[PDB]
């Protein structure tokens, strides 16, 4: 996916390599990519 | 007003409401009905 992450969001990986997404406005984390709405 | 599907309201030890999202398995103080804490 070439799109940037939207404002407030950061991507990290779990130890076992799963992408997850951190929302620093709402203080949430999720496997849902904020660019796609899917995990 | 009802929360979105999969969401629940809980309360902290000091009685502050917060929102539990069982679809994504996360929590926030920001009410998803309004976008404010």
């Amino acid at each position: 996916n070439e799109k940037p992450l939207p404002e407030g969001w950061e991507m990290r990986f779990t130890v076992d390599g799963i992408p997850y997404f951190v929302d620093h406005n709402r203080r949430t984390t999720t496997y849902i990519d904020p660019r796609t709405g899917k995990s | 007003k009802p929360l979105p599907e999969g969401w629940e309201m809980r309360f902290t030890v000091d009685g502050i409401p917060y929102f539990v999202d069982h679809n994504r398995r996360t929590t926030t103080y920001i009410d998803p009905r309004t976008g404010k804490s």
Binding site: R27 | R10, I16, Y18, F19, V20, R25, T27, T28
Partner: peptide
């Protein structure tokens, strides 16, 4: 510190 509520893993 920001205000963040209890974590899902801790309360579920």
């Amino acid at each position: 510190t920001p205000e963040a509520p209890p974590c899902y893993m801790d309360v579920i």
